[model samples]
Target chain A: TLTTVIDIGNFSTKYAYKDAAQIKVGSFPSILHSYKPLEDYEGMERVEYNGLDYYVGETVKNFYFGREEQMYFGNTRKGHMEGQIRLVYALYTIFKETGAAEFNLILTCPYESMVTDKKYFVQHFEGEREVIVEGKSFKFTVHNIVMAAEGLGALNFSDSLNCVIVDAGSKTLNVLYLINGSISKMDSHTINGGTIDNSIMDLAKTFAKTCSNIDYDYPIVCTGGKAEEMKECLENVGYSTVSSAELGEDKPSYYVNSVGLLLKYGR
Target chain B: TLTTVIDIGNFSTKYAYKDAAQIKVGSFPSILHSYKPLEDYEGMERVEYNGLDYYVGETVKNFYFGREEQMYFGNTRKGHMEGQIRLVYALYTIFKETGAAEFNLILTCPYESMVTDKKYFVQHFEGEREVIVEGKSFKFTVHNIVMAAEGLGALNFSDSLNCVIVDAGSKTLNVLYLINGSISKMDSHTINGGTIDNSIMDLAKTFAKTCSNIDYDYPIVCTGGKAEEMKECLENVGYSTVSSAELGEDKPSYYVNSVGLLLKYGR
Candidate 1:
C-alpha cells in the first residue's frame, strides 16, 4: 500500500509520495479558474468537478490576469468546494504520475479548521471516487484518510524538544509551542496577516510578540511557504537561534508540511 | 490672518481652520479622477491643474467603479504632485467657503517623510499661487507653511506626559510615545498594516505588542481615522485604560489629526 501526503495551503498545494526509499514532492498554485467547454482546448491540463470544467494549477495563470476570483487564499476550509477541487486535482496529478490506483491519503489543515472541519473533509475524500484529468477518466480508492494540524507536520524536521514552530503561510501565521515534541494547544495561536499582506518586519515582530510569554531559551523553527523570509526577520528581531527547517534536496520551505506529513504518516 | 490646517491622510484629506472663535472642520476623500473636457460638466467640483481637468472630493465617486487608481494613498509625501493636487483642491474648497485669500498653512506628514521631504513640501506651498476651482480662477497667498509629524499633532489632544498616542490611519499605525508631553523619537514608531489591510484584533494586538516594553501604567490614547476601532481592540487585548481623543461637535475620530494640528499650530 502506498501512502500519499497532501498539504493544501492558502497560496499553494504541496504533495509528497514515497517511491521505495525516496520521497517525491510536487506543488501547484491553489487556484482554480472555471470555464465552459472550448472548441479548441489544447496543451493545458483540465479537470471536471461536479459537471463544471475548470483549470487548476499553472494553467490558471494563463486565464487570470492577476485577478483570480477563485483563488484559494482566504478562510475557506478543507470542507469547502474550492478546497475539495484542489485536493482532487492534487490526487489526480499524483495518480497520473505514479499510476497508483489505491492509496492511503493524509492531508493537513490549520489547527482551527482541523478541529471543526476534519470529519467533513475526511469523509469527502475517504472512499472511492472518480476523477477526470485532461479528459482522461480514472477511478481511485482512498483506503483511509488522516487529517493533521498544519504546523504540527513541520515538527518532524526539528530535533529540538523545546522550540516554537512558526508556519508563515500566505494568509495566516500559525505559531505552535512544542515542549518535548508535543504541541501546547493553549500556547499555540493563529494570526490573520501573513507574508503576502504584511511586511517581513511586521510578521517577524508579530511572531516574536505572539511567543513573548513563552520562554526565549527555546529555539525558533520557521516553516511554511514564507519560512525562509520569516527565519531572516525572526533573527533580525533578536531571536538568537532562529533557523529554517531543513527540507533537503529540491524541496523548498513550502514543502515542509507535506514532507513532514509523509515522514510521520506514510506507513 | 487665518491659519488653515490640512492633514493629507491616506484615505481622506482632513482640513480645519479658524473662523472667529469657532474652529471649523471638513474632509473629502484623498482621491482624484482625471477626465477629458466634458460637454456638460455641471454639478461637480472640478479642478484644473497643469491644464488637465480632474474631479476631487465627492464628485470623483461618479467616475470610477471602485477602482480609484488616482487615490492619494501610500508613501506619496506632501512634496509629490498627487499630494500637491490634493492640497490644492483642499485649499480651493476652504478658500471658496471662507473667502480667505491669504492664510498660514500647516500640513502633516508621516514622521519619516517629515524628516526627508519637509523642506521641499514647505517651499512648494509657501508662496502665492493661483488655483482654478470649477473653472473659476482664484489667488491665495500661503504666507507660511509649518510641517509637523503626522502622529505628533495628536499630542495636542492628551494631557498625559507619559502616555502613548496611537494614531491608527488607513495604511499606517503611528504610535508616539510622549515624555513630558513631548515626543520621544527613539520610542515613537510606525508600522505599515492598518485598519484597511489588517483586522481590528490584529491591529490591537500589534499595538499592544509594539508597546509591550513600555510600562502599562501609562494609559493609551487612540487617535487618527481608525482611532475608535483601535481603542476597542486595545481594551480587548488587556490594555487597561484605552480611550479615543474627544473631537467635540460633529467631528469623528478621523478628524483628530486635523483638529490637533489646528489646536497646536492654528495660533
Candidate 2:
C-alpha cells in the first residue's frame, strides 16, 4: 500500500511518500503566462501548458519577482479552477521524478474550502487525472483520496488532551482544534496573516478569542515557516505548553502537517 | 406570476412579495426548544416543528434575548439545517400574511456564503415545505428559486457605471463591485466589521484600499443596516460621489437588497 501526502500550500506545494523518508517541495507562485513569442529569454525556464507556452513553478517564481500573479489563496475568479491547473501541473512534476502512478493520496485543504459545497471541489481530483508539462505527461491513478484540514494534519500532540495547532503558512494562519486525536471543524479559524506578518501575533490572539471558545490553557503547537516567532508570541500570552514540532531534521517546520498525515495514515 | 424576496440577516429576516411595495420583516434569533410543556407566557408565540415545539422568528427574538440558541451564520454545526428550519418557518409567515402559495423566490445570501459548496445549502431550501406556528399549518410550494448575492442584490443605483456597493450589515460588511450591471465576485471583499464597530469607518477604509483597486471617484452606493454611517465614512475618506439609496421611507437600509432583488428580477 502506497500513500502520498500532498499539501498544496499558498506559498509552496509539499509532497511526501509513505515508503520514502525524504520530502519534496516546489514554490507555488501566482504567475500566469500569455501565449506570445519570447525573444529567447535564456535565464528563465518555461513549460508548455495545454499547447501554449507558459512559465510555471520555479520558473514562474523567478520571472514574477516584485510582481503579481493570479492567486487563489483567499480569493479567486474561478474558485479553485486556477489553483487546480497549478496543482495538476505540480503533481506531474512529482510523477516525473518518482514514477509512481497508483497510490492513496491525502490532500489537505484550507478550513474555508472544506465548508459547504466548496468541499465538492476536492472530489474533482479523484480517479484518473493527467498532468501535462512541456508536452510530457504523467497519469495519476488515485486509488483513495482523503481530504484533511491543513492545521489539524499537524496535530498529534496527545490523544485525550485538548490541543490547538496554529499552523502559520506563507499567506494564511490556520488555527485548528484537536480534541481526542481528531480535528474539530467547528472550532477552526482562518486568520488572514501568515508567518511574514508583523501583526501576526495580534491577529492570532484576536482570532483565537473571537472565532472559538477554546481554553487558553490547552497545549498549542505552532509550526510552519514562522513557527518560532508565533511560539514566542503564544507563550508570552500565558499559554505554557506552546512549542514547535520537530517534524523533519532538515525539512522546514511546515512539513509537520505532511509528516503527521503520513504517520497517521500512510499504511 | 408571484415573486418573493427573502433576505436573512444576522438580526432580522426581511421578506417581501413582488406585488407589494411594503416589505415584511421578522427577527431570526437562534432559539431552540424541545417538545416540552410551557406555562402561560403572555405575548410569547411558539411554533411546532415536526411535532417538536420550537420558537422561531420574532417569537424567538422576544424569548431568547438572555438565552443561548445555536446559531448559523459564518460557520455551522449542522450546516444550515437549523437556519433552514427557521427560514421555512419565516417564509410561512410571509405566505400566511400575503395569501399566496406559488411564488418565484429570490433568496439573498452573504458574500462569503455564496462562494464554494456552502451556497449549495440554499438548495436544501427548495421543494415543498410546511410551516406550523401556534398550531396552525401553512404549506409553501416554491415554483422557482434564484440565489442572489447580498451586497450585489442592492446594485440598483446604476447599470452603466463601474460602481461599488458597500453593504454594511449587523455582522459583516460586504464591499462588492457592480461592473456594467452584474457583480464581480473576484473584485469584491468581505471585511470583518459592521455598523456597530467603533472602528468600522477605519476598517472599511483599510479594506477598500488593501483588497481592491476601485476608483474612489466612481459612484459608491452605501446600503444595509448602517448605510448612513458608511456613507458618511466614505465621504470623509474623499469619495466625492458617495450616496445612500432610499429603498423605503420606514424600512431599515437592510431592505435595500430585498427591494433591489425584487426590482431586478420579480415580475
Candidate 3:
C-alpha cells in the first residue's frame, strides 16, 4: 500500500509521499474562491465538487477580493464541507500525479483541536471519494487515515531529547517541550498571535523560565512559516544550538509537519 | 518645588509626583482629537495648545472616529509638536493638581529611541511652557529634564539581584536583562508585537535559554499595560517567583514606568 501524508494548515496545505527511497512533497494555498466559467477561456486550477464550481490553489488569487473566499481553520473546519473539498482536491491531484487508486492517508491538526475533531476528521477522509480537478475525473480511496498533532510532527522529525520545538504558524504559535522525546500535556502550549517575532520570543522566554530543570545544551528546533526568523531570534537570545528544520530540498518550512508525519506513521 | 515623572507612552500618559512621604500617580489616554466649542456644553477634558482647540484625554472618545486623531509614538514624536503638546498638557495638568509652579521633570522613551531623541526631547520639554486646559491657563517650568529608558524604570522599582523585567506595553515589548542592578547593552531587547501572551512567553523562553548561568530562583518582574497578565504567564511557565510591579496604591500597571522613574531620579 502507498503511504501519503497531508498537513492541512490554515495558510497552506502540504503533502508528502514516498517514491522509492525519496519522499516527494508539494504545497498549495488552502483557499477556495467561487468562480464563474467563461466560454472559450481556459482557467486556472478549478475544482467541481458537489455541484459547486470553485477555484483552488494559486487560482484563488484571481477571484480573491480581500475577503470573498473560503479560508477557514477553526475547530469546525475538520467536519465542514469546504474542508472536505480541500482534502478531496488535494488527494485528487496527488492520485492523478502518482497514478494511485488507493493509499494510506496521514493528516495533522493542532493538538488541542485534535482531541475534539479527530474522529470526524478520520471519517471525512477515510472513505472513497470522487473529485473533479481542472475538468479531469479522479477516484481514490483512503485505506487508513492516521492523525497526528501539528507540533509533534516537527518534534518527531527533529528526533531530539530534552528539546523545545517552536512552531510559528500563521494562526497560532505551538510550543512543545519534549523531555527525553516525551511531551507533557501541561508543557505543550498553543499560543495565539499574529506577529511571528513576538510569539517566538515569548515562547523562548517562557521555556527559559519554566524549563530551568531541562539541559540548556539541548538543541532548540524551529519550524513553520517563520522558522528561519525564529531560528535567528532564538540564536540572538543565546540559544547555543538553534536551527531551522530541514524539510528536504528547497527547505519549505510548511512541509515540516507533513514530512515529519510521514516519518512517524508511514510504512 | 515638586519632582514629577511623566511617561508619555504610545497608549497613555502616566505621571508621578512626590508629595511629602507619599507618591501620587495618574494616567490618561495619549490621544488628541479636534473638537468644536459649543455653548452650554460642559464637556470632558479639553486642551487649547498652539492656537488649536482639541479634546484631550477621555474626552477624545466623544469626538474621535475610528481613525481621525493624533496618537503617535514614533522616534520623531519626541521632537514633534504633537508630542510636545502631549507633554505640555500632561505637565499643565500635573502642575495644577500638585499646585507646583516649578518642578524637575523625568521622562521615558524606548532605549533605542532615547539615544537619538534624548537631546531633542530635553530641548522640547525642558524649558518653560504655557498651556490652557478647560479654558483655564497655567504656567510651569521644568527646571531640569532627565530621560530614562522605558523598561529601566520598572527594573529600578524591582531592585533585584539578577532579574528580567518584561514591559508589555501597547507599542513594544521591552525586555531588560539586569545583572546586579546593571544592564548590558547587548542583553536588553526591544521586541515589537501586539499580543501580550506570545511576547511574554517568547521572552521567557529566550531568557531561559540564553541566561542559563543566572539563578532561575530570582524574581521576574512584570510591568507595562499587561503586567498582571505577564506575571501569570511567567509563573505558569515555572519561574519560582513572578510578581507584578507594585506601583504604589491601586497598583496601576501603566504607572510602573513613571513611578519607577520617580524612585530612581526624583528628589
Candidate 4:
C-alpha cells in the first residue's frame, strides 16, 4: 500500500505518494540551457546540444552568452511553443542520471498554478512512457506556505478555525479562504507582487548581464528558502524589513523553522 | 459709495474691502477657542487679575501649568484662533503701543469653513456677542476669504503652468486646481492648514511624556518663515526625499518627520 505522502500551497502545489521504496528524485530546470559540456559534468566529455533545449545548471550560466540558440531558449511561452517538448527533453536528460529506463512520476504545481480540474491539468502530461499516476487528487487539499498570508489557512486547518491563505508568489499576491477542511469557494484577489521583485532583479541583471546571459541570481526576492539570509542581504544593502508586505504577521507560531517564510517572494 | 462687502461665510465672519485703498486686510483662524484668565496674575509680573480681558499669546503660553481651572477654554466659531488671533492681537497691541484706537477694523475668514450653516454646525465659534442694530437682531455678517482669492484673481500671476501651490499655512495639505488662469472654485480643500503644524508640535510634546515639562520642541527646534528652512534641516538629518520616502531610507528619520508634523499640526 502507498503511504499517503502529501504536499500543499497558497497557490502552491505539491505531490504525494505511498512509499519511498524505489525513489530517485532529481531535477532539471525548465529555463536553463547550456553550450559547453559543463565542467561540472566531469568525464562526460560532451553533452546533448539540441538547438532549443541544451543546458546543465552552472554551465548554462556561462554558455548562454556566447551561444544563445545552443543553450536555453527560455521557459517563456515562446520556448514552450510545442507544449512541454523542450521541458520533457530537459527532464529526460536529468532522469538519465539515475539510469532508470522508466519509472512512476509525481510532479507538482504551485498554489496559484493549481487548476480547479486537478486531474485535467495532470492529463496533459506526455512523453517518456508513464507508469505513474497523480494520487493526491481525491482527498481535500491543504497548503501552508510562508508568505504575506500563508499561515492563515493552515492555521485555520490545524487550529480548528477558519483560515485565510495568502501566497506572495513571484508574480502576484494570491489568496484563498479555507473554512473547515475545504476551500471557501470565494474569488481571490490578485495584486502586483513579485513583479516589483522581478523589476529589482532586472536592474541587478543589467549589471550582471554585461558579462553573462543567465537568470539574475539565486533566491530572487526572499532568497528562495533562505528568507532570513536574504533579509540580512537586504539590510546589508540598506533594506530594513525582511518582507515589505505592510500587512503581515509580526509574530508567528509554528512557522516553517528551517527556512524562514521567504520575504523576497522570489529570486 | 456703499462698500458692498459681501462676506459670504454662513457661520464664521470674513474680511472684505471696497477698493484697493479701503481693503480690510486681516486674517482670522478657521477656529475659535474660549479660555478664562489664570489666577497666577498675582505671581507673574506680566499678569493682571483685574484686567478687562485676559492677556493671551506669548504671555498666556508662559504661565499655564497642568491645572484645569487655570485655563478654561473654547475655540473659534466665527473668526480666528491662534495664528490669526495672535496676529490680530499683535496689531492691537502695537496700536496700544502707539496709542491709536479708533482705526477701522477688518478681519478675514476661511472660505472653505463657510460651506455649512450655523443652524447645523456648532463648532465654528467659541461664542458670539449680539448687538441691536435698527431693532433687528443684527448678528455681525462676516466676510469669508472670498476677498483673498479675488485679490489674487486680477493679478498677473506668473504664467508658469501646472504649478501646485503648497500654501504652507496654519493647517492641512490643501490642494487646488487651476486651468489656464481660470481657477476652479470647486477646489478649496483646506480650512486650517497651519494648525496642523501646531498639532504636530503638541503631539511631539505629549510623546516625550516627560515628567518635567521639557520645552516642547527642544532647545534647537527648527523654524521657518515659509517652512523651506525646516525642509533643509530634515535633509540634514538624512531624509533622502523629504516628501515620500523610498524603501531603504530607514526609520528614526521617518519617525522624526512624523513627530515634526504632529508638532506643527498640534500647535
Candidate 5:
C-alpha cells in the first residue's frame, strides 16, 4: 500500500507524495464568495459555466489580480476568510481533478490563526471529511514555537540550549522561548495584530483633514493591505518617527509596512 | 390578685387598675410646666397648683402638644424600647403624683416584635418591675389596645380572629390588634401625635412653602381635635384634588406633601 500526505492549507496546499519525494505545491486565495454562496467557488480560476460553481485554481487568482481587485487582509474578507475558504475549495478541486478520494490529509495552519481561532478550525472540518487531521493540530502543537526555534537551530546553529523562536509571517507575529527543546513555563503576551494597524489608519484620516489645503484627498487614504493607506497618509502628515525602515522579511515588502509578522522571542 | 398596670409611654403615663369587678383609668403626659422639679408645696391661693409641677391628665397632655417638641421614635432608640422606657418614666411620674407605690407593676407589650425580639424584650425588662404580664391586662394587656378590633369580633368571629385597628387620637394615633378575645395575637402601629401639627407652624412662616397663598408661621392649622384647622390646610393647598391623590405632577418625588409615619406590629 502507498501512503500520501496532503497538507491542505489556507494560502497553499503541499502534497508530500510519499516518503521518497519532495513536496509539490499549489496556492490559491482562501476567499470564497461571501454573499452569494453559489458564487463562492474556491479556485485560482474563474470558469463561468451556466449553473456550475467551479473551484478553478490559479485561473481565478489571475482573474482577480488581472482585474486588480482591492483586497485588505485584516480589514475585509478579501484579505481574510474569503481566501481561506477558497483555498479549501481549491484543494477540493485538485483532489477531484486528481481523482483521489481516499488520500490521507495532513492539515497545515498558520500559527496566527491557530492561536486566534483554534476551535474554529476544528469545528469547520470535524465530521465533514474522513482520513484527515484538522488544521489546528499542527499549528497549535504544545511546543509550536519550539518548531521554529528548532528550524532556526537547524537553519543556523551553535550549541545553545536556552533559545527562543520568533515566527513573523504574512499574517501573524509571535514569540516562543525554549529550554531543552521544550516550551518554558513562561507567560505569553498576546495582542491583536490588525488593531494597531487600523489605529494608524484613523490617524491618517485626521492628517488628511489638516492637509486638505495642499490639494489633498480630504477623506484620507485609509486603504491598506489591512491598513496600508493608513501608514501612507500618516507618514505624509509627518508621523516621521512613527516607524522604521530596518524591518526585514516580517514586513510587507511591496504592500504597506513592517507591522505584519515578527516574533520577538526573548530568552 | 390586685394588679396595677402602668404604661410610661414616650409621651405619657397610662394606668389601668384591676380589682375583681372594674378597671379604672388614669394618665398624664410625661411632662409638667416647670423648670424646677418642684421646690415647695405649701398651699397658695392663686394656685394650689401654681407650680408644683401639677401634671395629672390634661396638664401634662397640654405641655407636650401645647408647646413645640418633637417625639423621638426609633432611629433614636429603637422606638419600641424608647417607648417602653418612656412608659417607665411616665409611670415614675405617676407613682410620684398619686403616691401609689404599693402596687404590682405589670409591663405589657402590644408588639411582640419577634420571638427573638420578644426574648430580647423579656430579658430587657426582666427585673425592672414587680411583674410583667404577657399582656393580659389592657394597660398591661396589649390585647385590647384596639377597642375597634373588639368591635370587629362582635360581628361574628372565632378561632384566633385577626383584625387590625387604627385609633386616631388627640395627641397620637395608635394602631394595634387582637388575635382572639384574650387567647390570640397582637400587633401595633403609631403616628406622631399633635406635635406633627407644628408642620403647620411651618406653613405659618414667611413665603409659605406648604402652599403659595398662606402664611408659613402665621397659620398653623391642625386636625383630630382641631380637625377644622386641618381642613383649612387641605383647603389652602388647592383642596380640589382632594378626590384625586396626586399632589403636584411637576414637583420632585421627595418634595411632595406627604407624611410617612409608619409603624407595623404583627404576630
Candidate 6:
C-alpha cells in the first residue's frame, strides 16, 4: 500500500508521496483553471469531476481568466458544490501522477476547520472517485483518509515540547498553542492578516496579544513566509522568545505542512 | 478637517483619529456581520454598504449563525465587494462617531497591490460616497486621500537610517531594501507564506538569500504579526542583526503602517 500526503491551502495545493526510493513532491497554484475548448483538447493532466473538466497551471492560465475559472473561496461547502468537485479533481490529479489506485492518504485543513468539521469533511472527502483524461477514464480510491490540523501538520514537535505553533500563510494567520502536545482551542483564531496582508503589523500585534495570556515557557516556533519577520516583531513587543522551525533547507515553506504530515505517517 | 487613519484588513478594520483632547483608536472584526431583521434595528453602529445593512459586534452574532453572514474572502472585489464596501462603511462608521463630515484620510494596501496599482486604486478610492444609517442618508466626501506602501508606511525611519523594511502580515511578506533612503523595487516581492504560513521557514531562507547579495550595514527593522518570530529565526540562521520597530506599547502591529503613513504625509 502506498501512502500520500496532501496539503490544500487557499493560494496553493501541495502533495508528497513516497516514490520507489525517495519522497516525490509536487505543487501548483490552488485555483481551478477552466477554459472553453476552442478545439479538441489534448493534454495528459486533464481530469473531469462532477460534471466539469478542468486543466491545471499555465495550461489554463494561457486561456481562461476571472471568477469563472476561480471557483474556491469562503472556506465552506454550503452552496458551491463545484468547490468540492474542483478539490477532489485536484487531489485525484495528484494521485494519478503517482500511478496509485489505492492508498492511505494524510491530509490537513485550516485549524478552524479541523476543530469543527474534520470528520464531516473527511467523510465527504473519501471513497472512490473518477477522472477522464483524453476520453480515457481513470478510477482511484482513497482507501483511508487521516485528517490533521494545518498548524500541527506544519510542526514536528514532540510531546515534550511546550510551544505555540503558528502556520502563517499567504492570506491567513493561524496560531496553535501547544501545551505539552494538546492544542488549546480556546485561544486559537484564524487571524485576518498574514505576511501578505496590508495590516500585517496590526495582525502581529493581535497575534502577540493573543499569545500574551498563555503561560508557556518554551520558544514559540514559527513556520511560514512571514515567520522570521513576525518572530522579530513579537519578541520586540515582548511576547516570547521566538524561533523558526528547522524544516530542511531545500523545501519551500508551503511544503512544511504536507511534508510533516507525510513524514509523520508515510512509513 | 479632522485627520483620520483607517487600516482596512481582510480580518479586521482599525481606525485612528483625534478626539477632543487625545488620539482615540478603535477596531472591530472586519467581516460584515449580518442578521435576519425580525425587529427594529436600534443601534448607533448600523450602516448600509452594498445594499445590505450591517450591525457590528456581538449583536449580529446573537442572531445569525454559520457561513451566510460572513461571506467575504480573498481581499479581492468579487464576492467580497462587500469586503471593500464593508471597509468604506467601517471608515464611515468611524467618521460618524467623531461628528465630522469631511476629513483627510490616509490608508495603505498590500505590497503587491501597492507596487502594481497604487495610483489606479487611489484614484478610484477617493472622492464622494454615501453611507445610509437609520433611514437617514449621510453624504461624506473624502477631502484628501493619501496612499502609501504597507512596508514603507510601517516605518518611521530617518533618511539617515540604513535598513531593510519587512512588513510581515498573514498572507504576504514584503521586504523593502532601503539603501539609505532610496528603495529598490527590483528586490521587493509579495513573499508567499506569512507569520502563520508553513512556508515561513523558506520565506526566511529567501530573505537571508535576498539580503546576502546586498551590503546593508544596519539593522533589519521588521514590523508585522510574526516579526519577532521571523527576526529570531533570521538571526539564528545568521542573516543580519535584527531589530523591532517602536510603534508604541499600546498600539497593535496593524497601526504601524497606517500611523506611519499618517505621520508622514497626513501632516
* lDDT digits (tens) for residues A1-267 of candidate 1: 568888887678888999878888898887665565666655456777555566776656556554342244453445454457788888888876888888787878777556677656766665677878877887888868777778776787777768888888777788887788777888888766667657878888887776788555568788887788888877777777777887878877888978887787655
Best by TM-score: 3
Q: What TM-score, computed on C-alpha atoms, does each candidate reach?
A: 0.53, 0.48, 0.55, 0.27, 0.25, 0.47
RMSD of 3: 10.4
lDDT of 6 by residue, B1-267 (tens): 777877765455667777665567767765444434556654325667546676654244444244231322322311132345555665666765877777677666654556554444455456566777655777776767665566665557433366778876654567877765566777665554454434556777777765576544566777765666767777767655677665666876666656666556676
Considering every candidate listed, which one attains the maximal lDDT?
1
In terms of docking quality, model 2 is incorrect
Candidate 4 vs 5: which has more lDDT:
5
Q: For residues B132-151, what per-residue lDDT tens digits would candidate 5 score against the true structure? A: 21112112212222111211
Count steric clashes of candidate 5: 36
Model 2 CA lDDT for position A87: 51
Clashing residue pairs found in predicted model 1: none
Give stretches of model 4 more than 4 Å off: A1-30, A34-53, A65-79, A82-107, A110-161, A185-187, A195-267, B1-267
In candidate 2, stretches whose alpha carbon ends up further than 4 angstroms from where it belongs are: A1-267, B20-37, B48-53, B59-79, B111-126, B158-160, B196-199
lDDT of the candidates, in the order given: 0.73, 0.61, 0.67, 0.29, 0.31, 0.60
DockQ of 2: 0.02
Model 1: residues >4 Å from true position, as ranges?
A1-3, A8-13, A18-24, A28-89, A99-104, A109-145, A150-260, A263-267, B7-14, B18-23, B27-89, B108-120, B127-139, B148-267
Taking the candidates in order, what DockQ does each have? 0.03, 0.02, 0.05, 0.02, 0.00, 0.02
The lowest-lDDT stretch of 10 consecutive residues in candidate 4 chain A is A132-141
Interface RMSD of 4: 29.7
Interface RMSD of each: 13.1, 9.6, 16.0, 29.7, 33.3, 13.6
Of candidates 5 and 4, the better by DockQ: 4
Per-residue CA lDDT of model 2 for B104-217, tens digit only, reads 777777665565424444455465666677777767677566767886656765443678887777556677877787778787776654554336566557756754576667
**How many clashes does the backbone of model 4 have?**
67
The local lDDT score (0 to 100) that residue A68 gets in candidate 6 is 44
lDDT per residue, candidate 4, A1-267, as tens digits? 111111122111222221234322222232343334333553222223222233333333454476544443321221132323333343334333433333233322333434432443244443233311111111111122111222232332233334333343333433444555445543333333342234432222121211111111211123222234333433332223224222134322122211122211212
- Stretches off by above 4 angstroms in model 3 are A35-37, A40-43, A46-53, A65-76, A134-136, A156-164, A175-221, A230-243, A265-267, B5-15, B19-23, B26-267
